[PDB]
C-alpha cells in the first residue's frame, strides 16, 4: 500500500520541497536521510536510511539542482532528479511535444521501477502549474502516457490556477486550455487552487503582510498531508481514495473539487479563543477561507467530505454537521440527498519550524464538488477570446506543431465541461 | 473595377489503396448547380467546382482560358495551387510529368505556354517579347531552379518608388520557342524536383515558384503591363503531427507556419468589420510576392484539392473556409 | 548554456568594455583570471559568460570587431583586457568611414570570413549555445554594416538560435554626420529580418537621465555606457542565479512578442538617483515601480504616455516577496488603463532574481514594447526623404555599387513597421 509522488514545473518542485520538509519532520526523519526510530512514502534500505517514493522533473535545471545543493540532498537518490537543457518557454507545443518528448523515457522508466519496487501500488499524486511552460504540456504528455500503461491506479493532481488578476505569462490561457482537455481526459481528481485566495488567507488570518512563495507551499503541504497521511497514519474512520472517487464523483465528468483547511491562525491569535469543532466547521465554508477565487454561496453545492486531524469526537461532529445542514443557504441539488463523507484521523498536524502556523489541537480539510468552479472558467474563455479574436502570439505555437483547429477545438470542449456542469446544476 | 477573385475547386479520385480500406467520398460534389457538401449538410458555394476526372484541357477551358484572354488587359493575372501533400496539386497545375502520352499528364504549364505561343504564331504587330523565372523557395529561403545555385542574399525581392514587386539576382531565360519551354522546365523540376531536397516520397515538400514576364505598354510611353503566376504551394499537413516527426517534423513545421501565416493574410480580407485596417503583407516571402496578387486591378484565380475520405474531413473543412471568404 | 558576446564598432566595444566588467565585479573575478568571491553562487552557472582555462582562470566568451586598430588597443589597455585573448581582436587597418555601403556589402567580407570562424569554433567549445547578443551603431559605418552583415550569416548558420541586439538610434538633437540617417535606414531594414528581437538606446535619453536625475554636470561617456551595462546585467541576472521565475531569454521572447514583426524594445533601469538624495529615499516596490513606471526613466527618446503599451516585463533583484510585486503591478495596471491595450489582459509579466546587485539591496529592470517608438521612425524617414529627395551625396554609396532600389525597400519596409503598429496601436 504505497504511494507516488511527482512534481513538474516550478511551483510542482517547489510543492515538492515543502510538502517532504513536513513528511520528514512528521516522522523524525533527519534531513540528512536518516530516521532514530510510516513507509508509504519512503522504502527503506538496511542501512536504516529512507528514499522518498518520489521524482522531480523540470526542463531547466536550475531549480532541481538548487534542490540537489540544498540541506536536503541526502534525503534523495540521484536516478530521481531528472532534468533537461532548454525549458519550455511558456509554450505547450515545447513542453508537451516539442521537447519534452526527448525526457519523458527517462522519467516513465523511473516511475515503472518505483512501481516494481512498491507492493500495493494504491495511487500517485502530481503537482504542476496551468500557466508555465514546463509544468503544462509535459505534464499532460506524462498524463497521457501513464494512463495507457497503468490506467485503474488512482491519478491525483495539484494544478496551481493561474490567477484572474495576478498572472506571469502573457499565454496563461492557452497553457490553461490546452492543459485543461487532458486533465479532462485522463484525470481522476483534480484540486486546482488560486494564488490570490492564499494571499488574502494569510493576509487576513494567519497575519503575514509580505507573503512569499514558502508560506503558500507550506500550507499546500499541509493540505496534501491532511489528505492522504491520515489514511496512511491511522486513525479512527479511515476512508479510502477509492472512496474518494466513490462519493466526490456524481458523474464521470464532475469530478473537479475544491480544497479548504482550517484553522488558519497565527500564534497570538491562537489563544484569546478557544477552538471548538464547531467554530472550525463553521469557518470551512466561508468564501474568505475558500481556496479558489469563487463564490460558494452564489454556486450550489453537490458533494462535500471533510477529514479531521487530532481529538475529535463523532458526536460533536454529528452535532456541527447537523448546524450546516439547517443553517447556510447551501443549495444542496436535490440530485444529491446528503452528501456528508467525514474521516477522523489520530494524528494531530505538526507545525513546521520556522513556520508561520500556531500548533492546534484539531484541524479539518474539506473537499467539495459544487457548480460554482464554472464561474472561473468563463474568465479565461472570456480572456481567452480576447486572445484568440487577433490570434496574437500563435505563431510560436504553430511555429512549434500546433494547431489552431486545437484551439477552437479545446475551447468547444472546455465549454462543454462548463456547460455540463450547467445542466447537472439543474434541478428537476 | 476590381472584379473580386474567381474560386475553381476540384477533387483528385481516389486510388484503391484507399478504397478498400474504408475510405470513401463522404463529400457531395454538384457542378451544374456549382456546391460541395460535405456529411449531410455542409453545402459550401463556389461559383467554379470541377469534377473528379475533368480533363486537364477541360480544366483548361474552364478557367484557364479567360486568363489566357485578360492576359493582354495590361494588368497581371494569377493563380495558385493550394492544399495538402499528394492533393494533385503538381498534376493540377500539370507539370513535372514529362511523358507526352496523352497531354492528360501534364497540364497548366504546357498548355498555356502552347496556347500563348499559339496566340503569338498569329499576332506579332507590337513590340512585346516574354520572358519566365522559375525558382523554389524552402525553409524561408530562396534557391533558384533556372539557376543552379546562388546564396540567399544576393537572390533578392525589390520594391521600387512605384511599390511593384522586382526579383534580383534570379537567372533570366526568355522564351521563343516551346521546345526551349519543355526543356527549362524539365532541367528547372531536375535541379529543384519534388523539393528542394527531393522528397521522402515523390510529393509536394517545398514551394515552386513561376512567373511569365510580357509587356504590352499602355499605348515607347506609358507602361501597363500584364504578367502571369504559376505558384504551387507545399502541403499543409496539419492532422500528420503524429505522422512526420523528428528530422522530417523540423523540415515540415516550417512550412506549414508560412501556410498559416498566408492563412492569415487572406483572412483580414472580408473581415473589415472590427478596425478594419491595413493588410500585413510583408511577413513572409509568399505573401509578399503575392501582395500584388490581390486587389487594386490585378487579376487572379485560385484553385484547390481535397481527399474523399474523412480522414483528413477537418482539413477540407478548412481549406473550405478559407477558400470561402476568398471573395476579393 | 552559454552565451557568445559581440561587440562592433568603437561605441558598442568601449559599451561592452564596460558590461564585461560589470559581470567580472558581479562574479569576483579579478582583472588577471583568477577567481575572489565569496559565494559559490557566482561560480555555479560561470559557463554562461565564460569557459574554463588552467590554472583556474575563465576567458569571456568574447569577440571584438573593428575596422581602426586603436581602438581595439585601447580597449585592450584599459582594465580587465588582459582577460580577454587576443586570438579574438579581429579588426582591418582602414576605417569604413560611416559607409553602410562601404563596411556591410563590399569592405567587410575580408573580416566577415574570419571572425565568423572565429564564431564557429568558439560555438562548438562550449556545450549548449543559447543565443547571442550585440552592441553596434545604426548611424556609423562599422557597427552597422559588418554588424548586419554578420548577423545575417549567423542566422543563415544557425537558423532557430536567439538573436537578440541592443543598438544606439540616433536622435535629431546630437547628430553627429549627415550620411546618419541613410545607415539608420539600412540597418533598420537588416535588424527587422535578421533577428528576433532588439533593444532601443538614444545618447539624447541618455544625457537626459544622467544630467537631471543624476545631478550630473559632466556626464562622460563612461556613465552613459554604464547605464547601458546595468540593464544588459539586469536582462540575464535571472539566469545566472537561482530565482523564482523566468530567468530565461526565450521565455521573455515569447513574452514579449505578441507578434512576430513587433520586436523593438525601450529598457529602463532602476534604482537611479544622484548620491546627494540617497540618503532619503526607501527602496520598495512602490518606489521602484514609480520610477520605472515613469516615462522620465525611459532608455528610448520617446514618451510612452502618446502611444498605448502592448507589453511590458519587469525583472527584480533581491530578496522581496511575491505579493508585494503582483499587487503593484495590479494597482499600476489599474491606475494608468488608459496606455494599455485590450487585446492582452494582464499586460506586465515578471521575473524574480534572487541575488541584489553589489551596493544596491534590490534593483529593477523594465523592458516595453509600444506602438509609441514609432514616432523615432519618422526621425528616420523624414530626415531619409529630406536627403533622398535631392540624392544628397548618394554619390558616396552608389560607387560601393548599392542601387536606388535598396534603399527604396528598405524605405517602404520602414513605412510598413509604421503603419502595423499604428493598427495595432488601436
Ligand atoms: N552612449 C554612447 N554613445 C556613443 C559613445 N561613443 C560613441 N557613441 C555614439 O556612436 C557613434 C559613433 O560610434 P561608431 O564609431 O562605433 C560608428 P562606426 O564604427 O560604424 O563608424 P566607423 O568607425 O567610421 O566605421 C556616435 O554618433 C555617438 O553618438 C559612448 O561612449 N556612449
Ligand atoms: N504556489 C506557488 N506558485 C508559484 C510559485 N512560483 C511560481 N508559481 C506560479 O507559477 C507561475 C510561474 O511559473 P514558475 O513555476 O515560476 O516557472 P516554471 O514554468 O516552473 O519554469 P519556467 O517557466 O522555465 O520559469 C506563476 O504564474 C505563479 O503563479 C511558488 O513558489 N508557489
Ligand atoms: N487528379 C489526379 N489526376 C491524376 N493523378 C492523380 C490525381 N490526384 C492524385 N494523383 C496521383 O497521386 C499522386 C499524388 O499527387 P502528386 O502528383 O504527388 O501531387 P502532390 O501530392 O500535391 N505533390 P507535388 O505536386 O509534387 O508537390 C500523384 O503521383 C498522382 O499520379
Ligand atoms: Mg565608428
Redesign the pocket.
Same mark, same amino acid.
Given at each position: 500500500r504505497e504511494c507516488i509522488s511527482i512534481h513538474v514545473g516550478q511551483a510542482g518542485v517547489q510543492i515538492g520541497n515543502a510538502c517532504w520538509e513536513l513528511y520528514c519532520l512528521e516522522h523524525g526523519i533527519q534531513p540528512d536521510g536518516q530516521m532514530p526510530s510510516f513507509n508509504t512514502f519512503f522504502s527503506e534500505t538496511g542501512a536504516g536510511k529512507h528514499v522518498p517514493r518520489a521524482v522531480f522533473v523540470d526542463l531547466e535545471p536550475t531549480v532541481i539542482d538548487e534542490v540537489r545543493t540544498g540541506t536536503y540532498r541526502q534525503l534523495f537518490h540521484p536516478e530521481q532528479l531528472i532534468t533537461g537543457k532548454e525549458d519550455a518557454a511558456n509554450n505547450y507545443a515545447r513542453g508537451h511535444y516539442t521537447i519534452g518528448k526527448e525526457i519523458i523515457d527517462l522519467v516513465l522508466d523511473r516511475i515503472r521501477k518505483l512501481a516494481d519496487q512498491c507492493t500495493g501500488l494504491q495511487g500517485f499524486s502530481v503537482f504542476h502549474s496551468f500557466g508555465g511552460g514546463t509544468g503544462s504540456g509535459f505534464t499532460s504528455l506524462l498524463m497521457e502516457r501513464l494512463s495507457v500503461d497503468y490506467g485503474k491506479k488512482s491519478k491525483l493532481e495539484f494544478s496551481i490556477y493561474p490567477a484572474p488578476q495576478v498572472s506571469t505569462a502573457v499565454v496563461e490561457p492557452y497553457n490553461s486550455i490546452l492543459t485543461t482537455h487532458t486533465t479532462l481526459e485522463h484525470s481522476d481528481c483534480a484540486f486546482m487552487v488560486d494564488n490570490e485566495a492564499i494571499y488574502d488567507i494569510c493576509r487576513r488570518n494567519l497575519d503575514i503582510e509580505r507573503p512569499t512563495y514558502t508560506n503558500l507551499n507550506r500550507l499546500i503541504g499541509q493540505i496534501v498531508s491532511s489528505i492522504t497521511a491520515s489514511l496512511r497514519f491511522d486513525g479512527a474512520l479511515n476512508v479510502d481514495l477509492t472512496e474518494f472517487q466513490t462519493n466526490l464523483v456524481p458523474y464521470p465528468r464532475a469530478h473537479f473539487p475544491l480544497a479548504t483547511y482550517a484553522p488558519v491562525i497565527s500564534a497570538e491569535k491562537a489563544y484569546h479563543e478557544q477552538l471548538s469543532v464547531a467554530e472550525i466547521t463553521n469557518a470551512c465554508f466561508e468564501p474568505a477561507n475558500q481556496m479558489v477565487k469563487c463564490d460558494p454561496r452564489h454556486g450550489k453545492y453537490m458533494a462535500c467530505c471533510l477529514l479531521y486531524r487530532g481529538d475529535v469526537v463523532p458526536k460533536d461532529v454529528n452535532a456541527a454537521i447537523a448546524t450546516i445542514k439547517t443553517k447556510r443557504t447551501i443549495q444542496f441539488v436535490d440530485w444529491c440527498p446528503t452528501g456528508f463523507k467525514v474521516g477522523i484521523n489520530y494524528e494531530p498536524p505538526t507545525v513546521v519550524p520556522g513556520g508561520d502556523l500556531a500548533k492546534v489541537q484539531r484541524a479539518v480539510c474539506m473537499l467539495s464538488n459544487t457548480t460554482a468552479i464554472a464561474e472561473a472558467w468563463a474568465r479565461l474563455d472570456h480572456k481567452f477570446d480576447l486572445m484568440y479574436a487577433k490570434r496574437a502570439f500563435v505563431h510560436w505555437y504553430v511555429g512549434e506543431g500546433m494547431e489552431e483547429g486545437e484551439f477552437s477545438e479545446a475551447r468547444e470542449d472546455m465549454a462543454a465541461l462548463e456547460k455540463d456542469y450547467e445542466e447537472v446544476g439543474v434541478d428537476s | 473595377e476590381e472584379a473580386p477573385v474567381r474560386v475553381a475547386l476540384?477533387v483528385?479520385?481516389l486510388?484503391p489503396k484507399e478504397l478498400l480500406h474504408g475510405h470513401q467520398s463522404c463529400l457531395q460534389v454538384e457542378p451544374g448547380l456549382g456546391r460541395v457538401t460535405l456529411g449531410r449538410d455542409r453545402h459550401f458555394g463556389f461559383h467554379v467546382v470541377l469534377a473528379?476526372?475533368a480533363g486537364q484541357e477541360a480544366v483548361y477551358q474552364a478557367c484557364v482560358q479567360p486568363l489566357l484572354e485578360a492576359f493582354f488587359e495590361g494588368f497581371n493575372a494569377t493563380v495558385f !495551387?493550394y492544399?495538402? *501533400?499528394? &492533393?494533385?496539386?503538381?498534376? *493540377?497545375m500539370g507539370e !513535372? &510529368?514529362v511523358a507526352s502520352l496523352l497531354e492528360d499528364e501534364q497540364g497548366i504549364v504546357p498548355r498555356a505556354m502552347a496556347e500563348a505561343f499559339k496566340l503569338i504564331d498569329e499576332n506579332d504587330l507590337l513590340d512585346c517579347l516574354v520572358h519566365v523565372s522559375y525558382l523554389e523557395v524552402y525553409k524561408e529561403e530562396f534557391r533558384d531552379l533556372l539557376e543552379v545555385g546562388t546564396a540567399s542574399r544576393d537572390i533578392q525581392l525589390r520594391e521600387d518608388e512605384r511599390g511593384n514587386v522586382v526579383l534580383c539576382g534570379v537567372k533570366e531565360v526568355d522564351v521563343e520557342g516551346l521546345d526551349e519551354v519543355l526543356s527549362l522546365l524539365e532541367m528547372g523540376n531536375a535541379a529543384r524536383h *519534388?523539393?528542394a531536397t527531393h522528397?521522402n516520397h515523390? &510529393? &509536394?515538400?517545398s514551394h *515552386?515558384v513561376f512567373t511569365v514576364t510580357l509587356e504590352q505598354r499602355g499605348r515607347p510611353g506609358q507602361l501597363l503591363v500584364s504578367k502571369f503566376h504559376f505558384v504551387?504551394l !507545399?502541403?499543409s499537413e496539419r492532422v500528420l503531427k503524429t505522422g512526420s516527426t523528428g528530422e522530417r517534423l523540423k523540415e515540415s513545421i516550417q512550412i506549414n507556419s508560412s501556410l498559416l501565416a498566408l492563412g492569415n493574410v487572406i483572412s483580414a480580407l472580408g473581415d473589415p468589420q472590427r478596425r478594419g485596417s491595413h493588410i500585413p503583407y510583408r511577413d513572409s516571402k509568399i505573401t509578399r510576392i503575392l501582395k500584388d496578387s490581390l486587389g487594386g486591378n490585378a487579376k487572379t484565380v485560385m484553385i484547390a484539392?481535397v481527399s474523399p475520405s474523412s480522414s483528413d474531413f477537418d482539413e477540407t473543412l478548412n481549406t473550405l473556409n478559407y477558400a470561402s471568404r476568398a471573395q476579393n | 548554456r552559454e552565451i557568445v558576446h559581440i561587440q562592433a564598432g568603437q561605441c558598442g566595444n568601449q559599451i561592452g568594455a564596460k558590461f564585461w566588467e560589470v559581470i567580472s565585479d558581479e562574479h569576483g573575478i579579478d582583472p588577471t583570471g583568477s577567481y575572489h568571491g565569496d559565494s559559490d553562487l557566482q561560480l555555479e552557472r560561470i559557463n554562461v559568460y565564460y569557459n574554463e582555462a588552467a590554472g583556474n582562470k575563465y576567458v569571456p566568451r568574447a569577440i571584438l570587431v573593428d575596422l581602426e586598430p586603436g581602438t581595439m588597443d585601447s580597449v585592450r589597455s584599459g582594465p580587465f583586457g588582459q582577460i580577454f585573448r587576443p586570438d579574438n581582436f579581429v579588426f582591418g587597418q582602414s576605417g569604413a568611414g560611416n559607409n553602410w555601403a562601404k563596411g556591410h556589402y563590399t569592405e567587410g567580407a575580408e573580416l566577415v570570413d574570419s571572425v565568423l570562424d572565429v564564431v564557429r569554433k568558439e560555438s562548438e567549445s562550449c556545450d549548449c549555445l543559447q543565443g547571442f547578443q550585440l552592441t553596434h551603431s545604426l548611424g556609423g559605418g562599422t557597427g552597422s554594416g559588418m554588424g548586419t552583415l554578420l548577423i545575417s550569416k549567423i542566422r543563415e548558420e544557425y537558423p532557430d538560435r536567439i538573436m537578440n541586439t541592443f543598438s544606439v538610434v540616433p536622435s535629431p538633437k546630437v547628430s553627429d554626420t549627415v550620411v546618419e540617417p541613410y545607415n539608420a535606414t539600412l540597418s533598420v531594414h537588416q535588424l527587422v529580418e535578421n533577428t528576433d528581437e532588439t533593444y532601443c538606446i538614444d545618447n539624447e535619453a541618455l544625457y537626459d537621465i544622467c544630467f537631471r536625475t543624476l545631478k550630473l554636470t559632466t556626464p562622460t561617456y563612461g556613465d552613459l555606457n554604464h547605464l547601458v551595462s546595468a540593464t544588459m546585467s539586469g536582462v540575464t541576472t535571472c539566469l545566472r542565479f537561482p530565482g523564482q521565475l523566468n530567468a530565461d531569454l526565450r521565455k521573455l521572447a515569447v513574452n514579449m512578442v505578441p507578434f512576430p514583426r513587433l520586436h523593438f524594445f525601450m529598457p529602463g533601469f532602476a534604482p537611479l538617483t544622484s548620491r546627494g538624495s540617497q540618503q532619503y529615499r526607501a527602496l520598495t516596490v512602490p518606489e521602484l515601480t514609480q520610477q520605472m513606471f515613469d516615462a522620465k526613466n525611459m532608455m528610448a527618446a520617446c514618451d510612452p504616455r502618446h502611444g498605448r503599451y502592448l507589453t511590458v516585463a519587469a525583472v527584480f533583484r533581491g530578496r522581496m516577496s511575491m505579493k508585494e510585486v503582483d499587487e503593484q503591478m495590479l494597482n499600476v495596471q489599474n491606475k494608468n488603463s488608459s496606455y494599455f491595450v485590450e487585446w492582452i489582459p494582464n499586460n506586465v509579466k515578471t521575473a524574480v532574481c534572487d541575488i541584489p546587485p553589489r551596493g544596491l539591496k534590490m534593483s529593477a529592470t523594465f523592458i516595453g514594447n509600444s506602438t509609441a517608438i514609432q514616432e523615432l521612425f519618422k526621425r528616420i524617414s523624414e530626415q531619409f526623404t529630406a536627403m533622398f529627395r535631392r540624392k544628397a551625396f548618394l554619390h558616396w554609396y552608389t560607387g560601393e555599387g548599392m542601387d536606388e532600389m535598396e534603399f527604396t525597400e528598405a524605405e517602404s519596409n520602414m513605412n510598413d513597421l509604421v503603419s502595423e503598429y499604428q493598427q495595432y496601436q488601436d
Open positions: - | 476540384r483528385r479520385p486510388l473528379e476526372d !495551387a492544399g495538402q *501533400t499528394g &492533393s494533385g496539386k503538381t498534376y *493540377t !513535372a &510529368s *519534388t523539393g522528397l515523390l &510529393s &509536394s515538400r *515552386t504551387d !507545399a502541403g484539392c | -
